[PDB]
């Protein structure tokens, strides 16, 4: 997956020429070109130049051209991390994420993600899922591999998982639970809904839509109770979830709408009733291993179209750079 | 005098002596003082009950119609008085001030029931 882009549209391979012109402009407070950060990025060949690029990405984010951090520039940088390590500094840049502001919502997430599994990279690979969950993604077939890893770590970590990591499972469970293809997507949706509707009566609602892209509607357990009716018209932690709620600050809710602690006999029966029909109508980690084989038809044909887009882009970009210097 | 962004207002303006007020409705600016100069002088309002008990008001409505059509703002004590006049709709502050004393008397009637 590497030997395609490596015709990097050959340029200068220098750095002592470049790195002065990129902070003379900051000391004078000039706006900087959007291409010179990338030309710094496509000349890294040492681990100290990785940290040089990190300082300069930090200084490029705090700039008058705080926009124009283009996706192929990030793609060159993540190809630079794939060249050297792709073990810590890419993770640090994805986890800071505002000081640097990368955001590569592409197949670039999957290219960095699957290579973690090649060294199996558990604890360092878990965070990339946890930050792309906060992002909006998954208009791509990446839902299979994200769910693959997150159920690998479901069967690896087994606790209360934290105050908030129990919430940091659920959204990456739920938005890849848009799978109409199998009932395993509707199962991931259920396991998401269980442990995010579980924090609603534990701590409060605001923590769920604190930063992760959710919705402030307090009814989420019923949204699992209705997609299970969708299943029965077309899991076993919700059983402990609905009864664990039933066992022994700014209020947002209204005085006519009832608080959902008094409805736990209404949460027992509506859920314990329909599973008796799910019996009559109609493991997890092996299912996504079935899905890794059945799916992943490998759309690099769109990736190559983007490479063509960037070979269209940078040429007409540097044409105006040549004319801006002849205009003097 | 150049007023930095001044507009018209129809206000009261005092001209009574001490302990005997006498208002005067006047079309003036927003920033010229209370007893100061103006643009047009209108029919005044005497707030004291006269002999055999009347409080006298004057309204030159043919020119009050002219000024707020020309773009005059109005004071809330003036809008209460036009609401009492019926040239305006009655003021909601006047309505709820009536209702506040009516609910105070709704309390007072229960108070007079409890002390017999």
């Amino acid at each position: 997956d590497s030997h395609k882009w490596e015709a990097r549209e050959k340029e200068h391979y220098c750095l002592a020429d470049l790195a002065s012109l990129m902070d003379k402009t900051f000391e004078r407070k000039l706006p900087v070109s959007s291409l010179t950060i990338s030309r710094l990025i496509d000349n890294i060949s040492s681990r100290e130049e990785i940290d040089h690029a990190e300082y300069y990405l930090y200084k490029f984010r705090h700039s008058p051209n705080c926009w124009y951090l283009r996706n192929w520039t990030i793609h060159t940088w993540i190809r630079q991390c794939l060249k050297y390590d792709a073990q810590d500094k890419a993770l640090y840049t994805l986890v800071n994420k505002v000081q640097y502001g990368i955001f590569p919502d592409n197949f670039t997430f999957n290219l960095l993600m699957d290579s973690f599994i090649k060294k199996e990279n558990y604890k360092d690979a878990l965070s990339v899922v946890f930050e792309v969950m906060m992002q909006e993604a998954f208009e791509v077939p990446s839902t299979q591999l994200l769910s693959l890893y997150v159920l690998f770590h479901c069967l690896a970590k087994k606790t209360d998982f934290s105050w908030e990591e129990e919430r940091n499972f659920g959204a990456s469970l739920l938005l890849p639970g848009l799978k109409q293809k199998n009932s395993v997507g509707f199962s991931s949706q259920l396991y998401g809904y269980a442990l995010l509707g579980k924090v609603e009566l534990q701590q409060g609602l605001r923590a769920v839509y604190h930063n992760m892209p959710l919705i402030w509607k307090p009814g989420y357990l019923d949204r699992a109770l209705q997609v299970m009716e969708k299943v029965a018209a077309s899991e076993a932690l919700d059983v402990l979830g609905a009864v664990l709620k039933a066992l022994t600050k700014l209020v947002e809710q209204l005085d006519i709408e009832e608080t959902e602690q008094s409805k736990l006999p209404q949460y027992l029966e509506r859920f314990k009733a329909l599973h008796s029909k799910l019996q009559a109508l109609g493991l997890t980690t092996q299912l996504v291993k079935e899905k890794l084989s059945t799916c992943e038809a490998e759309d690099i044909a769109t990736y190559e179209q983007n490479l063509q887009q960037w070979h269209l882009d940078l040429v007409q970009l540097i044409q105006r750079e040549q004319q801006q210097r002849e205009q003097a | 005098k150049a007023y930095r962004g001044g507009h018209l207002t129809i206000r009261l303006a005092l001209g009574g002596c001490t302990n005997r007020p006498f208002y005067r409705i006047v079309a003036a600016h927003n920033k010229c003082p209370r007893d100061g100069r103006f643009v047009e002088q209108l029919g005044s309002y005497d707030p004291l009950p006269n002999s055999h008990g009347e409080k006298l008001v004057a309204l030159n409505l043919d020119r009050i119609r002219h000024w707020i059509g020309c773009g005059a703002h109005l004071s809330k004590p003036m809008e209460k008085l036009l609401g009492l006049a019926g040239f305006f709709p009655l003021h909601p502050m006047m309505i709820t001030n009536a209702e506040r004393l009516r609910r105070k008397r709704a309390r007072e009637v229960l108070l007079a029931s409890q002390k017999t």
Binding site: R61, C66, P213, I215 | -
Partner: protein, 201 residues
């Protein structure tokens, strides 16, 4: 006639310091979250916004977590969700973010409005970007989030006057003269105006 050289020259010097070292958005828009004051102004905040400013985040510290700064995303004020059950939100067209702010925020953005199920083109500037009442509508269930389906008499002093006026005009014509409130529009007070019409202080 005496021409005022220093009194005219000083307006130029005050203009090139209202324009050059005027302080940017981070250095007059932050809030001490403990003492409820502000940097560079020091005047405390209203007590109708203490819980909402302690507890809920602002617009562009939330919306700096998206690629190309959330170029087509939907967002909605916090008390908009409390007062308006109908859809009222912002589509985005452009963000001009602050850069000097660590944990980058406090930009100026402008885009398309929707109010209570009614939207309109000609993307104007958005109000209350520094305010702590913001909540992001995510790209999941945005299609479920967007969902939506006379004559009053005159004052009685005019009622007596204009009847006598028509009786002078020639026809009594006891059809009741009515002023139209259908031509008068009834926007509420939470309705936002153009951010340009206010200036920064």
């Amino acid at each position: 006639v005496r021409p005022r050289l220093i009194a005219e020259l000083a307006r130029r010097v005050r203009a090139l310091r209202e324009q050059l070292n005027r302080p940017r958005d981070s250095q007059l828009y932050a809030v001490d979250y403990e003492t409820l004051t502000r940097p560079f102004s020091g005047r405390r905040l209203p007590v109708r916004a203490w819980a909402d400013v302690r507890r809920e985040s602002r617009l562009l510290q939330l919306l700096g977590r998206l690629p190309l700064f959330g170029l087509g995303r939907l967002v909605t004020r916090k008390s908009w969700l409390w007062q308006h059950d109908e859809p009222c939100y912002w589509r985005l067209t452009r963000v001009r973010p602050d850069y000097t702010a660590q944990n980058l925020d406090h930009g100026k953005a402008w885009g398309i409005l929707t109010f209570k199920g009614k939207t309109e083109s000609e993307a104007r500037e958005i109000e209350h970007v520094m305010y702590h009442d913001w909540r992001l509508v995510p790209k999941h269930e945005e299609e479920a989030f967007t969902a939506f389906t006379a004559s009053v008499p005159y004052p009685p002093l005019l009622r007596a006057m204009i009847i006598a006026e028509r009786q002078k005009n020639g026809d009594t014509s006891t059809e009741e003269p009515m002023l139209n409130v259908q031509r008068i529009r009834m926007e509420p007070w939470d309705y936002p105006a153009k951010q340009e019409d206010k200036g920064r202080a």
